[PDB]
Symmetry: C2
Subunit: 309 residues, 2 copies
């Protein structure tokens, strides 16, 4: 009866932070909940965990294997993004900031979705609404989740209310927003220590675009050209992944967080549709896409339009 | 920019109350929201609107027709229970206490689902959470929804937090909980004014139970015996429906909403799948199903299990 609280596959900072923050809150409310992760923390999240001196959630792969019948999803609701046997257990709660799709429950449940910058932002309000004090380290993982998802509040996903949230969490966490923000974001640009295969699967999701299974990965870097130093291995890793997972197209978003621009490297059957989604020309399989920092707002939408559905 | 707020087709008290109350709330929050209905009030709801003297929402049939592109749904989420052009508009918010299915959004949205007795109960908390004092008449329709969906807090669907809510909405609406409730519930048991075919179809559903097509209807009455005065005319309307709709089994629930029992009348090929389902014996085509007041929580399972899985 231990309720498992977890974010999406290829957990990012917001996924981990929101699940940890929410699990703690559930416990304060008398619920036997435990935060777990569907994968190992990425470099950005590792930085956060280390910073506030807390351990990463246990990594699990099957709810049933862990003997759990009830789960709480944070930072996602779509089944392909959840635990492998999500269809076999009961989803009792969901706290997320994404559109809803490929989600279904047999019974009523709790749901708190808000079209804001991060799932962590929502959990924060739940602490306030329940009158539960926020511990320093919990504030830290929540703040980190918000900072992560909004690129230190500079991303188009930043909601009007997020800055105030970010400000209060920073205070509770004992950090200077800009200083901590920049340090953490930079921690995610540690890509050299990763293999090409791992690099393209650090932060990636799949989208069904008018019948095409399109993989869209993102990475934060201090320089697009640095990431391209291994373009060959990366393209190779991309083609391999495409064959292994059934992807007709693979889009790699190389985001320069300093200059707020992203390089688009795409391979597959419909690279021409990619070129159409952004009106550019892929040379050696990539092109510059100025001002792009958000996958959900500045990439998927145009890819959706060009592929159509 | 004009958001319609509505409950589900064939609205009950909760559907009407929750949309009216919530729409009012959004307006106090600066959102140009308007409560609309997908049908006219039933005897129960007409009794409520009159008691607190307020007009029932205007019945509409299309969001596109009302000049609205955005909509807020209360007391439901499944598209088949919604507005005709639901897939054509944007769902900006959902307040409900049902399971989720046949629901999808292209973009992020606000969702507030809680596994409680009524949708009105959730709206109640939304008022307090937003610092908006609840208006007398509004408390009236909200209280009615809660009392209606939970049979004056007696149903298995009643949540631990529902009583206090019911209690507080009564105080605000200026009524005594126990009297207004009974008086309101009794007011809605008007069956003699409807034809047999109408009864067996005012609140029924269909369930595929291993190849069988079983109709399961529910009628609220203050006295089963009285409805049993029309047994014959009923079995006729039943046999008829089974002929026209292919139904292999028809189970009628004559729910006595004051004692919490439901006499089960069954005609069909598997009138044994039912007995073995409620461990009773159909003496005259019907048996006594004590404690039954909820179809899915007290009738579906056993049926679902007797027909085996
Ligand atoms: Mg992201
Ligand atoms: Mg009901
Ligand atoms: Mn995430
Ligand atoms: Mn997120
Ligand atoms: Mn309803
Ligand atoms: Mn309801």
């Amino acid at each position: 009866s231990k309720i498992l609280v977890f974010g999406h596959q290829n957990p990012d900072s917001d996924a981990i932070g929101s699940s940890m923050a929410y699990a703690y809150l559930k416990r304060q409310l008398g619920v036997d909940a435990q935060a777990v992760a569907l994968g190992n923390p990425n470099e950005e999240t590792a930085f956060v965990l280390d910073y506030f001196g807390i351990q990463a959630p246990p990594v699990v792969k099957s709810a049933q294997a862990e003997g759990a019948k009830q789960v709480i999803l944070t930072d996602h609701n779509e089944f392909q993004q959840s635990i492998a046997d999500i269809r076999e257990v009961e989803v009792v709660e969901v706290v997320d900031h994404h559109r809803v799709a490929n989600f279904e429950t047999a019974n009523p449940l709790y749901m708190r979705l808000e079209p804001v910058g991060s799932a962590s932002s929502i959990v924060y309000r739940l602490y306030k609404e329940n009158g539960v004090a926020i511990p320093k380290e919990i504030a830290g993982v929540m703040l980190s989740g918000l900072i992560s998802d909004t690129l230190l509040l500079k991303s188009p996903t930043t909601h009007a209310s997020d800055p105030a949230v970010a400000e209060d969490l920073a205070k509770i966490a004992g950090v200077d927003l800009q200083e901590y923000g920049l340090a953490m974001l930079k921690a995610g640009t540690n890509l050299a220590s990763k293999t090409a295969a791992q690099l393209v699967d650090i932060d990636a999701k799949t989208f069904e675009l008018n019948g095409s299974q399109v993989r869209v990965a993102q990475v934060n870097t201090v320089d697009i050209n640095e990431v391209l130093e291994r373009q060959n291995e990366i393209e190779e890793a991309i083609k391999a992944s495409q064959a292994a997972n059934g992807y007709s197209d693979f889009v790699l978003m190389i985001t320069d967080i300093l200059n707020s621009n992203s390089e688009i490297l795409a391979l597959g059957n419909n690279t021409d549709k990619v070129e159409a989604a952004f009106n550019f020309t892929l040379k050696n399989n990539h092109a510059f896409l100025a001002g792009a920092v958000s996958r959900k707002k500045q990439v998927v939408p145009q890819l959706t339009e060009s592929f159509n559905g």
